[PDB]
Write a structure and sequence with these properties.
This protein has no helices and eleven strands. The protein has 105 residues and is mainly beta. It has a single domain, classed as Immunoglobulin-like. Bound molecules: copper (II) ion and sodium ion. This is Amicyanin.
Amino acid sequence: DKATIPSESPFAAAEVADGAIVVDIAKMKYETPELHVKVGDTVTYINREAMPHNVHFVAGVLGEAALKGPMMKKEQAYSLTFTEAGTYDYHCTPHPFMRGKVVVE
Ligand SMILES: [Cu+2]
Ligand code: NA
């Protein structure tokens, strides 16, 4: 796959790793809707608002299967470690008007 998943569970915002590239979620938006990272970087999404959100990549984007990330409650987080250059678009499953992308380069 073009990304690996360190934790299938969401985890606490305080548990975010040094060196992770953070995208905050608040006001029903991904706060960095276009993020540029390098191969091998870990991107960590952190939900900063009461409304639960996830990240969802359709099939073929990160690998053969869709990746429907777990729902993050407020102050929960979720990571992906990207292993291949490319453009990876995602959305929020319950809120598909929320869109972003990670460009790995
Ligand atoms: Cu959402
Ligand atoms: Na992004």
